[PDB]
């Protein structure tokens, strides 16, 4: 339970993985060469971390255990040009000459299943090299159907392979307003059922919310995909803060599994991070921890295009960085309960988990961040997720009415039966989620 395997699938997934590895290097002060980087600490690695993501070698050079898979050679060449490839092993990465399809047709097809055995034996060899395992981390965008199908195939193969560690999947969601890809809703809906069958826990993040945040909080005129990558890297690092750096209240992955799954089928947590702001305003403004807890409930920090007030509260967790006073956060959570911002349920209500980590948050130079000694990462289970599901499903059905494209999918690897089945599965999931949220 000391190692976590991270997988980078698709173009956006590979970029996010690159950003997370760069941020992990920056937190521990790791340079492209390293050898640890360098050997003086304790707790920059060793000891753990790095012992959860970076593989320890006989020479001491920490190899970040990452598997970059994509059938687009340009992205693979790009990620090979950087020093990250030197950090990784040349055999860990997988290359493809011709992209699967646009986008989910071949990504889930048997052509995408041909490399399944290759990557499976790669993962088996990597596990044989290391010692112990806590879970499987996944990084693929639900917008990219290629990455979606490939990640679902890997998740199914890992569930059929080990089934002993919690399968984590970080999914990127497109903007509900505009969609550049016309089959993007089809790919996402078809992938939802696969992730329901395979994933033990999910992560839903919206690009449009990230862009609104960086335009508003960081006060930037021009958003960039690199800024989104940096923000998601900060998020992912905030998730595994206790596993990398020791804190006053070290939290476990199994604790996340217990808190986020209080029912037979509840594995959809929403992410919120605060305080996030421009570094200049961070130098100008100094808020309290209660203000940060309140901003955690704002619609912007939730990284979703849904209002959290209509959502119904469920079991949530809050990770804290740097120095954090227990009595202060107790007072803050009591004040929050007194506010009754999000409507509470009858099962969970006393469901605010608190975890503290000594590692203070780090601000990347590319993307601004509120420079503060203590950060707050809230993983909630509000019922706005059902709202996003219905929002995308309405457009999915409006399309599938005429669907304008079904010939390609039914000829390549699919059929209208599979589309109808995925639609019914999404509808049943929405109905069950609304039911479990409304019975309180």
């Amino acid at each position: 339970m000391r190692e976590v395997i991270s997988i980078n699938v698709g173009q956006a997934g590979c970029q996010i993985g690159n950003a997370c590895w760069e941020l992990y290097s920056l937190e521990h002060g790791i340079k492209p060469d390293g050898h640890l980087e360098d050997g003086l600490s304790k707790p920059k690695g060793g000891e753990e971390g790095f012992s959860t993501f970076f593989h320890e070698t006989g020479y001491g050079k920490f190899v970040p255990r990452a598997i970059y898979v994509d059938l687009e050679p340009n992205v693979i060449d790009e990620v090979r040009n950087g020093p990250y490839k030197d950090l990784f092993h040349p055999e860990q990465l997988i290359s493809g000459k011709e992209d699967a399809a646009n986008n989910y047709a071949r990504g889930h097809y048997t052509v995408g299943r041909e490399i399944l055995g290759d990557v499976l034996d790669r993962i088996r060899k990597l596990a044989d090299q290391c010692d112990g395992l806590q879970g499987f981390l996944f990084t693929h965008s639900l917008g990219g159907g290629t990455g979606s199908g490939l990640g679902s195939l890997l998740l199914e193969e890992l569930s059929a392979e080990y089934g002993k560690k919690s399968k984590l999947e970080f999914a990127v969601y497109p903007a509900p307003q505009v969609s550049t890809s016309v089959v993007e809703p089809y790919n996402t809906v078809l992938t939802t059922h696969t992730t329901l069958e395979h994933a033990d826990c999910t992560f839903m993040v919206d690009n449009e919310a990230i862009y609104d945040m960086c335009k508003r909080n960081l006060d930037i005129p021009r958003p960039s995909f690199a800024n989104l990558n940096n923000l998601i890297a900060q998020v992912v690092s905030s998730v595994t803060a206790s596993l990398r750096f020791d804190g006053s209240l070290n939290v476990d992955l199994n604790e996340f599994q217990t808190n986020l799954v209080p029912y037979p089928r509840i594995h959809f947590p929403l992410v919120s991070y605060s305080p996030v702001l421009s570094k200049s305003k961070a130098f100008h403004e100094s808020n309290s921890v209660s203000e940060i807890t309140n901003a955690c409930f704002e619609p912007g920090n939730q990284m979703v295009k849904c209002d959290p007030r209509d959502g119904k509260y469920m079991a949530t967790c809050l990770l804290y960085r740097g120095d954090v006073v227990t009595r202060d956060v107790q007072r803050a959570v009591e004040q929050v309960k007194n506010k009754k911002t999000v409507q509470l349920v009858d099962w969970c209500p006393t469901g605010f988990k608190i975890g503290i980590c000594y590692e203070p948050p780090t601000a990347t130079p590319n993307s601004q961040l509120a420079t503060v000694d203590r950060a707050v990462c809230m993983l909630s289970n509000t019922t706005s997720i059902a709202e996003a599901w219905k929002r995308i499903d309405r457009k999915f059905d409006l399309m599938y009415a005429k669907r304008a494209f079904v010939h390609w999918y039914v000829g390549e690897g699919m059929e209208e039966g599979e589309f109808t089945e995925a639609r019914e599965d999404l509808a049943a999931l929405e109905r069950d989620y609304i039911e479990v949220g409304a019975d309180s």
Binding site: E78, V178, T180, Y211
Partner: protein, 427 residues
């Protein structure tokens, strides 16, 4: 499948391919002899894509020029830029097509088809990463309207897996050197609508209008129009030429630009339409480029999008632009033009931005639209069809050629199928 071959045919399409190669070597940087001068490695990969690395660091373009009158290909071979051309690239015969659909392929093409298929097979053997063909020809030109349709049918029958892409220029309906030109155009499109997966509409009259407005020249120069269409082709292929935030394949563009196997016709538009001296008057901003892409006459297809109906639109940009800014602009123009834009998609937009910018332009844009008004651009020609051989003038020529009324009625029925699809899908 990253490599592409630029096919060339037609008495005018050869100049188009020449200007395309010239713009390529001027944009990425290359010597006329073939010595590599681009920077640094992605341009070398694109040289691998479009050229063959010859001995001594030399490059040779992967183009197939097949026409008649070898004097023209010899003269353009004497050009300075055309010094790196391989003798196997151009396969020319004698002597002239006579500007008739029969002699172009039915009489002369039957003997050169074996040689050109041998050449294309040797090319496919030389490079296996081939994914599609880029064909520039004249739909009204005799050599073009004759040989292009036959070679396209041959490629469709032999290489169905490989993609298709053509840049045929449409004959002007108002002015014509002869009445047989649109007739051959119709007899060619009769099969082009079947054996082609992608085509671009180009009208010489629209080119004359845009050079009278922007270039502001009384007598239009065909070389400048070649330069414009070559810049358009370069901005189209920049998705693979230069890595950007999102690079797409021609198959990915096609599956999103057409819902059905039909709709191969596409309306073209380029920006910025820089007029001489207007470089200081105006500054490069994305709303101006959007307005230019919205202008009916700025299109070179050319059709009126207001009279028609937006079926599928896609504007691919180059340079330094913001994703949120262009998304806001596209949402604004879809909301304000909701009557033009079809609404059951509801978002018929497909934008792909290129990282680098073209030389001399801080930002550029290539817009490809699909409107229902294009049926008119067909109808007139079809009308001209029923207006030209209803008098049965020079019909003895075609009877001696061996053509029958069955294929003419078949071309008319193909136009009828096209307009019915334009009204299925009512405008």
């Amino acid at each position: 499948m990253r490599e592409i071959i630029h096919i060339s045919t037609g008495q005018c399409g050869n100049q188009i391919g020449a200007a395309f190669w010239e713009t390529i070597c001027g944009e990425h940087g290359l010597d006329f002899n073939g010595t590599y001068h681009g920077h640094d490695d992605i341009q070398k990969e694109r040289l691998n894509v479009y050229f063959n690395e010859a001995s001594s660091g030399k490059w040779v373009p992967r183009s197939i020029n097949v026409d008649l009158e070898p004097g023209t290909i010899d003269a353009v071979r004497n050009s300075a830029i055309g010094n790196l051309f391989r003798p196997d690239n151009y396969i020319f015969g004698q002597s002239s097509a006579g500007n008739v659909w029969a002699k172009g392929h039915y009489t002369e093409g039957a003997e050169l088809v074996d040689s050109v298929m041998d050449v294309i097979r040797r090319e496919a053997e030389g490079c296996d990463s081939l994914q599609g063909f880029q064909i520039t020809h004249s739909l009204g030109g005799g050599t073009g309207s004759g040989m292009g349709t036959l070679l396209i049918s041959k490629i469709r029958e032999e290489f169905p897996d490989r993609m298709m892409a053509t840049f045929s220029v449409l004959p002007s309906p108002k002015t014509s050197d002869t009445v047989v030109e649109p007739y051959n155009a119709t007899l060619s499109v009769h099969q082009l609508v079947e054996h082609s997966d992608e085509t671009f509409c180009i009208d010489n009259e629209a080119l004359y209008d845009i050079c009278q407005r922007t270039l502001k020249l009384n007598q239009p120069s065909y070389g400048d129009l070649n330069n414009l269409v070559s810049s358009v082709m370069s901005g189209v292929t920049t998705s693979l030429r230069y890595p950007g935030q999102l690079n797409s394949d021609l198959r990915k563009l096609a599956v999103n630009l057409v819902p059905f196997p039909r709709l191969h016709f596409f309306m073209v538009g380029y920006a910025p339409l820089t007029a001489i001296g207007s470089q200081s008057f105006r500054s490069l901003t994305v709303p101006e480029l959007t307005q230019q892409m919205f202008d009916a006459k700025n299109m070179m297809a050319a059709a009126d999008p207001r009279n028609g109906r937006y079926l599928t639109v896609a504007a691919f940009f180059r340079g330094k632009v913001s994703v949120k800014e262009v998304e806001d602009e596209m949402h604004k123009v879809q909301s304000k033009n909701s009557d033009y834009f079809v609404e059951w998609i509801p978002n018929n937009v497909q934008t792909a931005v290129c990282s680098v910018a073209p030389q001399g332009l801080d930002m550029a844009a290539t817009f490809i639209a699909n409107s229902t008004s294009i049926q008119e651009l067909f109808k007139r020609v079809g009308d001209q069809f029923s207006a030209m051989f209803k008098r049965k003038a020079f019909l003895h020529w075609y009877t001696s050629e061996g053509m029958d009324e069955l294929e003419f009625s078949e071309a008319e029925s193909n136009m009828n199928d096209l307009v019915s699809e334009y009204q299925q899908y009512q405008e």
